[PDB]
Amino acid sequence: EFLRFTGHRAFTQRLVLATLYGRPIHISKIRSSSATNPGLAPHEISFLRLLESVTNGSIIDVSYSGTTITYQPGLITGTVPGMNASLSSDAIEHVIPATNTRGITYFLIPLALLAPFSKAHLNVRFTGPGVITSATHGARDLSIDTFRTAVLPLYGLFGIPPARIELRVLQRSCAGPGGKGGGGIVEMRFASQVRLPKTLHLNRRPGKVRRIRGVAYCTGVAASHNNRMITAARGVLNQLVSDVHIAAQYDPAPLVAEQKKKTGIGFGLSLVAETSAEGVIYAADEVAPPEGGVVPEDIGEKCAYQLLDVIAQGGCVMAASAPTVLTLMAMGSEDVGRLRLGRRVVSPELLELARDLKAFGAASWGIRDADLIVSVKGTGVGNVGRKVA
Amino acid sequence: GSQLKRLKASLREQGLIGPQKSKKQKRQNANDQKAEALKSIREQFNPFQFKTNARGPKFEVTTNVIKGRPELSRARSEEKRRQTILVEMQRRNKVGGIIDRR
Amino acid sequence: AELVAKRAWTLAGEATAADRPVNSLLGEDMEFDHVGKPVPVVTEEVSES
Amino acid sequence: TSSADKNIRIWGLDFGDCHKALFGHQDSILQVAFIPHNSDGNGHYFFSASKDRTIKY
Amino acid sequence: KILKTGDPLIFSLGWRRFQTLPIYSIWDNRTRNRMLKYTPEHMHCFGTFWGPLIAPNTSFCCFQSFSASNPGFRIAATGTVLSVDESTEIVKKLKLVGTPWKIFKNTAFIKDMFNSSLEIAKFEGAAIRTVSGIRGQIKRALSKPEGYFRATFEDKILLSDIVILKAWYPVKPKQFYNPATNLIGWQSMRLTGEIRRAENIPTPQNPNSTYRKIERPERHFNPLRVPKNLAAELPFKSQIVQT
Amino acid sequence: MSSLRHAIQRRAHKERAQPLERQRLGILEKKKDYRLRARDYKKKQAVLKSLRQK
Amino acid sequence: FIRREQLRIKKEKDEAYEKKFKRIIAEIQNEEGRAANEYAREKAAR
Amino acid sequence: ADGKMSKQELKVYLSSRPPDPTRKPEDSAELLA
Amino acid sequence: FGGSSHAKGIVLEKVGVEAKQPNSAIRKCVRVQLIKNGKKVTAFVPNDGCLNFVDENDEVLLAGFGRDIPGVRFKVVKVSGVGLLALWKEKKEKPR
RNA sequence: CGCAAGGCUGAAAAAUUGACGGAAGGGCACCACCAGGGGUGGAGCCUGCG
């Protein structure tokens, strides 16, 4: 309630940094111009409920008009058998309503980068009507396999071990009727907590893009969709790379309660390019529009084009994973951390992130040349509550 | 009549158990319902789904039989006991909750 | 004043009928051990299985 | 869509999802046609002519 | 001096000096975090208070009073910060104690333990226990005297026994926080013994609670008492001979 | 072991007694008295069972 | 209902605890015995 | 198509675990026995 | 080990801190990391009342164990430069 | 450690022996006849079940 924010840009990032630094915040003027549906979005209020379930001692207050919330932060407890679930290994359930349009990866990136500072493990299980696990059009949120093989290697670089990260889907869903809809359930078992994340050095040039691996998923359509998408991607990328390999996954359909109905039919593709240097990976994805019915050949060509744009653009991290690696950089110890961005990669969201870090109390960023090198000063808070043995 | 014999008589009236008709008989039928009939038959021939009085009403009054579903009632009350008692047993010691005034 | 006053009936060790008020157990929430396996109540899932 | 497998499919024509497979005739279903005018409010009705001497609406 | 839970204590931890009142606790057998009432002599017990957070593995000290008239060793306790949390789970034993009323071979009615059939029907199916070691179960409320109940035990309990029920009541510390602004001036909360010596109240004691010596006579039993029909009917080889 | 505990570890725990408001009913039966009762009653039941078999 | 829920919780919790510490005891005994046998062989060679 | 990757590459990517970056009767005696 | 008699190490994790019975061997054992090799071994603290004394990330000296988990070879002799038996007997205060 | 572990896909038969009956003739039944008896159901108390 002390610190002051405005606007709805990077709402989850503001909440997550408030929770990490323990600085109590007040976000005013959420949707002031939109008199049709002013105030909070349903994905935002579901994110509030998720954060309140995972935390402990957090007092969140949404005002009457809902255009302003306050947040006094508690501690990141996790799923303890006394407070959040019944067993130490029991998955905390989370249900989000059918009126959701943003992706479960938009729900999941804040949860993942808030996970390794917890007390116990994280066993969060997202079910419910509105859980879309594919790419969304929206503001182009990632897919689940994009999220996994495109940002969890970064925690593996930090030292949060990928052998003990555990993320699994059980049903897959695309958007469905309109932007709303879904059905797929996911669950996430962070069994790896750290005290202080290791400061890192992405400095050496990631020149030779070695290999390209990916996934083509279909939920409700024939396998010919993914196979034509594979022909598209390989016909566009065989001019440059010989080892492109894209798996294909097919799920029947997800069923949603109202007397169930089958929803969330769609098809999408996710590409990952792995550099020979180190954990440097460029990811892109594309989903069919939820009512369009467009050519899978066109979708394969479109996603291959987006991947090649991120290839020619990026320094060492892509634009979707830049804020996560930067906030974990700032979470790191009281040292400088050396990240190599590309000149085209800096975004208004990233500049807003730097603004919010300066506002909260993390030290600044020093920028120089080598694409450009940013050097973050970590604060070294680490996890507040962890039973030392 | 017995349960078995009444059930067989009801199914022969419903045409689900009858003798194997010819193609001519199938033509006659296709020349010339059973879902609601079958649901009534299962409801009436599994009578321990619901608690019933044998004597009937004590004093007959005319104006214009099940008396409760114990299995359905137990499942509903157990679901309510889930969503209240198991919830508080999980959040036995939990400080601070979202205050939603909208 | 709270420290010098007499402890409550809960924070005493040995509570009985003359000590505590009438339905104070209804007011309270504690835990205790149980014995024996309770009888499995019939549910529609058990009957359907 | 009527096959010689004695059955027809209803497809959604966006993403090509089989809205319903349905078996309805003892022989090969030969021809299937809709009714075009929805001005009576019945544009999603269709007839199927089948080699076992049947029209099914 | 030993130090009691609930009693104030001035902690020196990080930069802050701050007087707070902790809650001492043992970790009973790595299950339940039982609340103590005094710290054990020469043992590490789990303390817990309400104060400002510090990252773990940070050692710290504990005084009782910053006076110079203290004739010996002002520092009281040491230790290291184990972790932090909100909404602790401290647990104290509550012993609901009754008394047998009528005693059959196994089942026994118990009187001075409950006040109403409501409370008993809350505690139905409960694991009651005697002092002798006989386990047992609270089974069903009784009706005619309001509050009595029926328990099924293992073997025959005696009218001299006492039935106890061992429940776990949750205790939460108090959220006191002095800062010890010693250069400016500050109010130091006195302890228990000082409060009692100040406003002249004697320390509470129960004559039921103080330890005494028991006088056990040598327990002799009655001899065997065979029923008449059995002793008449058994064969000649084992007929009892009683002059 | 046995040299890895202090004398305060070895200190015996005192046995509580019957409350003074209930001393008239006899001695408070603790574990040892209970074992005496169980041995005596089980022995008498054993001999009575053997006589019933006979 | 509280009887049933607490019995299920206690059973699953005791099962998980027993399984985990069986694993940990076996692993530590395995590693320590392997090193002890390696040292016994490297000592017997002198 | 040749998008079919491998059993190993499926185990790396489509698994639940995220892919880490930090990897790259002779003789008569024996007959009688 | 090595060629020496007493090796130094860091307490990595007091594994078996959540055992039930107090003097269980899994309760007493402590996983450490020998400095001279960077190796991971496991050592015994002589009593649970002194497992309370050993703290995480402390320069812990250990030696041989000559006589429930047969095969643990090392036992803790010093913690942070102070004799562990004296710590348990409450002779010296542990310098941290 | 490896196999199991790659989705023309999207919830609601056998028969030379088989299916269902009908007519006659038997046997059994205080869930049938026959002769009687006794409950409950009227008023109040309450466990229990819905």
From Swiss-Prot, chain F:
Residues 15-24 have a biased composition (Basic and acidic residues). Component of the ribosomal small subunit (SSU) processome composed of at least 40 protein subunits and snoRNA U3. Interacts with snoRNA U3. Involved in nucleolar processing of pre-18S ribosomal RNA. The chain holds residues 1 to 54 of 270 of the full protein. It comes from Chaetomium thermophilum (strain DSM 1495 / CBS 144.50 / IMI 039719) (Thermochaetoides thermophila). The lineage of its organism: Eukaryota, Fungi, Dikarya, Ascomycota, Pezizomycotina. This is U3 small nucleolar RNA-associated protein 11. Residues 1-24 are annotated as: Disordered. It comes from the Eukaryota. Belongs to the UTP11 family. It is found in: Nucleus, Nucleolus.
